[PDB]
């Protein structure tokens with residue numbers, strides 16, 4: 001591709017990423033610094049209750065640790081629909097075989113979720129409820145039984161990922177790259193998938209060089225983070241299997257289980 | 262950053278050391294696997310009967326166990342060769358001693374499976390310095406847990422070999438693997454990442470110059486480190502299983518210490 005076509009691709013994805021994801025990294029950072037309506041902090045059991053009364057968190061219609069877990073599931077399901085709409089804007093994506101589109105999203109949404117969750121994290125906690133709340137890392141770590149170690153791997157990824165200091169215009173391309181992974185199981189026609197990823201990778205490379213000229217081999221260092229994402233996804237699955245085998249206060253309305261499957 | 266002439270000098274240095282440190286190169290392995298070589302033809306082991314003649318021609322346990330111990334013995338020799346190659350990487354021996362050990366502890370197996378790919382095609386693997394060739398089917402047919410220990414390596418090899426790297430490419434890539442700042446327990450991450458930055462720069466230039474028509478080969482190679490990580494994980498699980506089930510069986514001290522955590 002030509003240099004002007006790569007910038008065009010970059011600007012297109014950035015615009016689409018803005019339309020598809022309400023809470024962008026730039027907005028989340030403003031909130032987390034102290035540079036903008038300040039968020040409601042949840043740092044213990046009592047300030048959780050108060051936050052449910054005042055903000056009426058949609059991830060709270062049980063036991064506290066359970067309700068919080070389930071609330072992350074509710075938000076993940078929301079994120080899936082935002083990512084799915086974003087995918088449709090990727091040039092070439094809707095022209096792929098429909099089963100392949102489903103297959104790419106099925107395996108890619110989780111890597112994307114955690115990529116974008118880092119945008120809402122710092123070393124001390126995570127923004128929730130479209131940025132109206134802030135749940136502290138220490139309050140998450142203090143949840144009983146297996147729920148106390150559910151978010152901590154995400155935080156540890158987030159601190160290292162954020163050190164790369166990507167902005168939304170970088171991330172928009174990076175997210176596209178994740179979706180167009182030709183190595184997903186069951187793909188029927190890998191060749192146009194990798195053709196698109198090649199254009200996205202080229203565009204990501206030029207974008208990082210233009211936007212971070214002083215950050216040597218940021219492109220490679222970003223690609224290596226896809227190892228850290230895949231590992232986090234595998235560990236998450238491990239935690240679910242353990243939860244389903246051990247916790248019985250998990251079951252909800254059967255219709256709820258189907259929504260959250 | 263570095264100058265082009267410095268990056269070519271680094272690539273030339275590593276390829277030279279790679280030749281000196283690893284007797285059985287990919288180029289040698291492929292010449293043996295292709296043919297038109299009456300002098301280089303291996304003895305082919307495809308069932309229990311041909312294994313017995315192979316003991317006589319190629320040179321008190323059970324077959325599945327002998328085979329598995331064999332691979333462990335050859336993994337030890339590989340660690341030796343990889344260690345010798347690591348000392349040649351500029352900056353490596355200057356690092357904190359504990360970190361050198363940590364980089365090798367977590368690095369060697371990802372390198373073993375990388376270089377094992379060089380000895381493989383979809384139908385089998387060269388053994389005994391290329392004197393033998395063991396079919397993938399005969400390996401898959403081994404009893405108990407040992408029937409599945411090589412198959413993940415084959416599946417990786419098939420996809421890794423599709424990149425068509427040669428030894429000079431692999432010399433830099435192996436260097437990048439060793440100098441991973443993200444290994445657990447590293448004391449001084451920063452001087453490790455400075456080296457890997459120079460190695461990444463050198464690898465990128467090398468791949469562009471050597472495979473000018475292979476678009477984004479650099480990025481595609483970096484994504485292979487996820488497959489490496491997962492093969493290692495699955496091997497670790499198999500060892501824990503063998504330790505609880507095969508009390509006869511012993512391990513080289515070198516491998517025992519690598520495996521500890």
Ligand SMILES: O=C(O)c1ccc(-c2nn(C(=O)c3c(Cl)cccc3C(F)(F)F)c3ccc(Cl)cc23)cc1
Pocket residue numbers: 059068071072073075076079112113114116117120126127128129130135150236
């Ligand atoms: O491990 C997973 O599978 C997982 C975990 C969390 C999210 C996740 N949460 N989130 C919240 O901010 C949130 C909200 Cl909005 C309301 C209530 C609670 C939460 C929170 F506790 F989970 F944090 C997100 C916002 C954006 C995106 Cl992309 C992802 C998330 C996803 C997956």
Ligand SMILES: O=C(O)c1ccc(-c2nn(C(=O)c3c(Cl)cccc3C(F)(F)F)c3ccc(Cl)cc23)cc1
Pocket residue numbers: 328331332333335336339373376377380386387388389390395410411496
């Ligand atoms: O699971 C692991 O961790 C593992 C497995 C195999 C090797 C391994 N074997 N090998 C053999 O030649 C061999 C022998 Cl000697 C006898 C029988 C079978 C084999 C072969 F099928 F595995 F190939 C190698 C040669 C070079 C290198 Cl670098 C690695 C190996 C290492 C680790």
